[PDB]
Subunit: 273 residues, 5 copies
Amino acid sequence: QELGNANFENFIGATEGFSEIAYQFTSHILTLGYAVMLAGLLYFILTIKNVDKKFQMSNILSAVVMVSAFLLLYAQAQNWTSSFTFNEEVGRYFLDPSGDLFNNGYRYLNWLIDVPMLLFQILFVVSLTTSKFSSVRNQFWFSGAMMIITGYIGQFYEVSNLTAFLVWGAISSAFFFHILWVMKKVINEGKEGISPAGQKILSNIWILFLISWTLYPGAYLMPYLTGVDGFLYSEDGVMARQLVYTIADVSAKVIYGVLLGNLAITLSKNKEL
Amino acid sequence: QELGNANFENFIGATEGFSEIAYQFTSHILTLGYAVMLAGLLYFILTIKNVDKKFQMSNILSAVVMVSAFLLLYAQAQNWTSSFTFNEEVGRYFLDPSGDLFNNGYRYLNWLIDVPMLLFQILFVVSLTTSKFSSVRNQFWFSGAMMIITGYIGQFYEVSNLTAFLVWGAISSAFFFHILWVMKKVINEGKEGISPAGQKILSNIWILFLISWTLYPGAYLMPYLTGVDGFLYSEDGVMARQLVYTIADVSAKVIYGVLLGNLAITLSKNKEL
Amino acid sequence: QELGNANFENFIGATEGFSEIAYQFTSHILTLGYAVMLAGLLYFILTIKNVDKKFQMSNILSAVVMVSAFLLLYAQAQNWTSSFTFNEEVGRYFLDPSGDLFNNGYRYLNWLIDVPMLLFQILFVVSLTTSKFSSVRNQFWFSGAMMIITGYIGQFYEVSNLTAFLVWGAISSAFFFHILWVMKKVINEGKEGISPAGQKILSNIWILFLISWTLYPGAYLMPYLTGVDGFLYSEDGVMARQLVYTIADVSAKVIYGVLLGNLAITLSKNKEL
Amino acid sequence: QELGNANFENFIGATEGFSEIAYQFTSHILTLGYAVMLAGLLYFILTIKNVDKKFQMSNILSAVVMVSAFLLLYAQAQNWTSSFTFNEEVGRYFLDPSGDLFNNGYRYLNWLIDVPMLLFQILFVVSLTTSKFSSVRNQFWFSGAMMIITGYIGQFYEVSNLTAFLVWGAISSAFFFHILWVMKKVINEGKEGISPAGQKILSNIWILFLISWTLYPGAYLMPYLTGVDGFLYSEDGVMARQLVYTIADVSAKVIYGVLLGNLAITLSKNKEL
Amino acid sequence: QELGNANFENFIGATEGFSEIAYQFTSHILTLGYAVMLAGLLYFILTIKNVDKKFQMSNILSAVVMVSAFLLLYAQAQNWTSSFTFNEEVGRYFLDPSGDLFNNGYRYLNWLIDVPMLLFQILFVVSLTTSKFSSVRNQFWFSGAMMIITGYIGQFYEVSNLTAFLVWGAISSAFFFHILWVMKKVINEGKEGISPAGQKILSNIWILFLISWTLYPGAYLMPYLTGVDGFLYSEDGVMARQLVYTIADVSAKVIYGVLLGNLAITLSKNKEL
Ligand SMILES: CCCCCCCC/C=C/CCCCCCCC(=O)OC[C@H](O)CO
Ligand SMILES: CCCCCCCC/C=C\CCCCCCCC(=O)OC[C@H](O)CO
Ligand SMILES: *C/C=C(C)/C=C/C=C(C)/C=C/C1=C(C)CCCC1(C)C
Ligand SMILES: *C/C=C(C)/C=C/C=C(C)/C=C/C1=C(C)CCCC1(C)C
Ligand SMILES: *C/C=C(C)/C=C/C=C(C)/C=C/C1=C(C)CCCC1(C)C
Ligand SMILES: *C/C=C(C)/C=C/C=C(C)/C=C/C1=C(C)CCCC1(C)C
Ligand SMILES: *C/C=C(C)/C=C/C=C(C)/C=C/C1=C(C)CCCC1(C)C
Ligand SMILES: CCCCCCCCCCCCCCCCCCCC
Ligand SMILES: CCCCCCCCO[C@@H]1O[C@H](CO)[C@@H](O)[C@H](O)[C@H]1O
Ligand SMILES: CCCCCCCCO[C@@H]1O[C@H](CO)[C@@H](O)[C@H](O)[C@H]1O
Ligand SMILES: CCCCCCCCO[C@@H]1O[C@H](CO)[C@@H](O)[C@H](O)[C@H]1O
Ligand SMILES: CCCCCCCCO[C@@H]1O[C@H](CO)[C@@H](O)[C@H](O)[C@H]1O
Ligand SMILES: CCCCCCCCO[C@@H]1O[C@H](CO)[C@@H](O)[C@H](O)[C@H]1O
Ligand code: NA
Ligand code: NA
Ligand code: NA
Ligand code: NA
Ligand code: NA
């Protein structure tokens, strides 16, 4: 079949098809995804007043991210079930092009919301020392955008052109490293001159940030992480990718937001953890 | 028909089909399900301020659970009606694979929200005596996760491999027993040093918890509870399973949350029941 | 055609079909139904603070009922339009079984929310005298449940087995009479020790309650109220049934809730009508 | 092809079909319709506290109307696009009966909400002098109901029976004139004993009311306003009808509500404008 | 085939079809669009209380615009995916007329909300000096309406009649220039008698306004900006148009609203950023 510049899910779906477990699990994990986001939305709204006014923007930005994430993961859940249809004769789900090809690129473009806001929102809780607010913000936002856009281009080629896939991915990785760099600075400066409780949380946030954010390039490479004709170039790889996205999403968005809220509480002059 | 690792609903639906009553009732009970959850959401939000600030997190976590439950039960209600279609010639509803196979696994993965939050939220109402908050929380969350994941794997095999079904089920049961153990401790410690009215509510909560939570493994086993080719391996079993889920869901989520709210009110220094 | 234990709408729809007016009107009246409920939801939430704190639970329970009613009536409106399809050749709408058979049983199982809550909520506005709150509540809830469940079973047989239809209906009626009995007691005790204005409202509530609630068994019997092959065993009967449900729903849920709110205002120490 | 007692849109759609512009515009104007209503809902909720407590019921009733209007206009927008389908061969949209016939009667029955509430809500801003509240309310509500119901019957016959169409329309018109009568009285009495600023607003409200409400019988007659085989008995008439409804809806519901809110502000003891 | 007065997307879709990237990207960018608007809705509501009462109407109007924009962009996202369907044989997406033709005119008519409200809302933050509030408002609203309506007519002809396209576009442009004129006045008068911080924001608002609003006529002309049979009369032009709309929408609605909120904060007598 002629699929063109399509994600590898579609090639698996068109050739081997998906077992009941593979198809159902992918549907389940995406559903959990969007449910978590909408639950998180409620949490962040309902806890706004648990922190000092100055910190409340962080709650608000968490909520903004939840809205984005809910909408996208919901759409993507529908896209999954529309794109693959049961074949009675062999008892697997095969690519149903009338539903459109499945594309992960939905996620990517919504990151244009999530990434800028997630990076931004910490700057409403921590105080910088030697770094300027506007400067950090601008670096986050520029490098965030470039990371996403370059990766977005890349993922169209993950089957059709491995070279473009890897080159765009590499360029994206550079901007990622920049972001990691800046966020580390921010965390360090954030730690300076605050309670030990606050410092503990910021340590945790950094570990969370580092692991969760690194999962995303993991998902990018997922089909090829066991090399050519490897275990993961398969329905098992498809499952793994969406699992990793979902874990990353919950970690990088919800848990991150929760930790920041807890930080805000310790820093809050009225309130006590 | 090759169905593979599919839930037993699909085998009944593919062979015998479902009578009007069986199909309609399952649709009705799932609809009631999600209606209750959204109504509950409203209740828990609207009553937040009926308790002291310190107890309000319990309301919030109830609401979180309601969102999860609403979304899932709604999706599942749609899945039911999509998966089975009326045959004019015999006047029964048969498996329509273009709708996808029906799978209960949707529930399971959403429990990754519900179970942790339901277990967590009592720790915001009762005071422990012997036990550490963080320790109880961690036990709940670890054992909760393992219970769910192992059961999730199990249920894919409920027809295709009875042995895997029962072994995974047994492993899951172990973690369940752990949770029951810990929750009993929590309830006992909770009773210490509160009014007799509060103690009565906690007694009720324990009975509610024990019965409602045990329904879930009941639903797991449902098709086989009357043995091979028994009464329940049938449309009647399909009905029973979804009824039991719905009773469990209402009991374990809504009523539980209401009782905790009532407990919080008695414990509240301002307020009176 | 083999329909089995199906509602009479399906038999009319399968044989004669529905004229433009009959089909469209039924669609319109169901749409009005769910619109009223969602409007009511907004009303009850937005007026919570118009009454003293102690009365506010009544507003909350009204809102809970509105959510249930909205969801159900919306679903049912969709069910109507899915179940009957235009035939170009004769210019009528006929049963389209790909949409599923139409069933009123959706309503019934949702009453498991509405009835308990509607009966419960008056006990938050009026004070009982000689009767115990818990006792009245338990009577309402038990008899409510039995009324609904028995009727639910009944209505499956309204065509397939007139005898079961009438017997189950009769049993249901018994529990109905019990509820009427208890509600009268409650209204009487409610009147004791309140202003004449409050007493007037409770008088109206009783009339509303009695008429609106009696419409429901009216809708049950509707097809047969002009006897065999009567005027009402027809599209005209179909229209009448859904009209009666909608009038009943608006009366028993929204207007009831409004009157209770007005009562609460007169009883409120701050406020005046 | 017998359409029976169907609206004239269906006859145009079945014979000539709709050009791109006609079909698209009708879709656009209905979409604008429901967008306006949901935006208005938000406005009326968010501005509740801009007026004194006694006036706030007017905001609440505006919101109620917005909910009704949103739901209905949304449904009707979907009905439009479902009822007419592109024919590739001639490049026009023709009646697609699988979507159901299009019927304006959806609007009519929802007016049973809107009209009573719109008429009612002014009585929470203005003070009557010589007229009794209950009497005005009762006249509005009775005549409102009769106006709508008689018109609703009428519009089913707009093609199938011109005589019934016009007679029912005439009867409806009588009740309309009654409403105009009463509302004029109310406006006049409302003016008595308030600031000249308030009096100006009430003058505007009356003009708005008179024009916007008269558009509705305009839309009723629309196909025939250029007589038999006239310019308007055509896709141009179809466009015009839905445009006029939408203008009327925005004027009679949203702008009306805004003006009443502004009146409430001038009458408000704290607030200025 | 015969498409008539249809947008150029349909001609590309009917002849060449859309590559995976073109089709998917357009779907993604529209999805981002509506996600941003709903996230923005949350932001504007949640930040209402960050400014003095007098400024809060600006927040409210931002929210109103977000509702409009969300609804429209959501609808349009669905319209995109319905209008173009994958062809397995050639591996491109082609016009699927059963989904309706794609039309950008949905946007235009919703601008009847957005434009008036966006222009209006600044008049609640800045103080005019020499210009009258009512006069500015009326000019904005009249010229806004005429700009939109004339452009709306124009865009139907973008393929079918280039002359009408350009003439209507030109007329529209005239009203655009009027709006630019008035807004400049408003911004200048706004700057008078406020802090330099406020003045800086208003400078930014003007640049934002000028660029973002000019994108809209850019999108209008997009297919022809590289002349006949140019690079942009192609799927690449289709992509570009929807990208430009989305950038414009985010800039002119969300960012604009954010800046106005920031202005309101500086002008606010309590508050500090
Ligand atoms: C201050 C208020 C000012 C109000 C301003 C309102 C202006 C309305 C005028 C419209 C006429 C323009 C219509 C132009 C139509 C062009 C027709 C055409 O080009 O026809 C080509 C022919 O069919 C072969 O190509
Ligand atoms: C090819 C180009 C030819 C096209 C020609 C179109 C030119 C339109 C330009 C400006 C319109 C200005 C009209 C604005 C006047 C609106 C009326 C108004 O708002 O009056 C002020 C208010 O009444 C006081 O309070
Ligand atoms: C809530 C969403 C988040 C936090 C998304 C983060 C996304 C990334 C860190 C993406 C990184 C990528 C690379 C570093 C290489 C491959 C391309 C990307 C964009 C997936
Ligand atoms: C709101 C959802 C709740 C409270 C879910 C609880 C789920 C369980 C207690 C599941 C238990 C299971 C076993 C003990 C064995 C079979 C597998 C499970 C997961 C169904
Ligand atoms: C909001 C819904 C309400 C108030 C429903 C009330 C339902 C009843 C009073 C039903 C009564 C029935 C009988 C008395 C006999 C036939 C079976 C029933 C359940 C329809
Ligand atoms: C928000 C909806 C409103 C204000 C609806 C008003 C409807 C009318 C004023 C209808 C009037 C009619 C006539 C006077 C004759 C034809 C039949 C009607 C019902 C359209
Ligand atoms: C939020 C939506 C906004 C701000 C829309 C603005 C729309 C315009 C400025 C449209 C301008 C046009 C022209 C000046 C010529 C072509 C026709 C229009 C309407 C696209
Ligand atoms: C006051 C705030 C100022 C924000 C400055 C930060 C700018 C971030 C905007 C990112 C824009 C990126 C544009 C990329 C162009 C396309 C390049 C893709 C490579 C092919
Ligand atoms: C981890 C980053 C580098 C991984 C590059 C691995 C090279 C993958 O190689 C690819 O494997 C596919 C699946 O087996 C084959 O279908 C392709 O033909 C082949 O190009
Ligand atoms: C702990 C309770 C579990 C008992 C499991 C024993 C039932 C297994 O019995 C199973 O029944 C199915 C339907 O009747 C048959 O199709 C299977 O072949 C059979 O193995
Ligand atoms: C209390 C009211 C109950 C009256 C019972 C009357 C039974 C009507 O009789 C039924 O009428 C149907 C429709 O005409 C027929 O299709 C059935 O065959 C017939 O049994
Ligand atoms: C107050 C306005 C009512 C005037 C009645 C006008 C009579 C319309 O006449 C009707 O016109 C239709 C379309 O042209 C034709 O199809 C019908 O045959 C004809 O009866
Ligand atoms: C101000 C910008 C307007 C420029 C007008 C450019 C005229 C383009 O001309 C058009 O181009 C189409 C696409 O190539 C062709 O299919 C048409 O035949 C042709 O009329
Ligand atoms: Na599927
Ligand atoms: Na079905
Ligand atoms: Na239908
Ligand atoms: Na259509
Ligand atoms: Na598509």
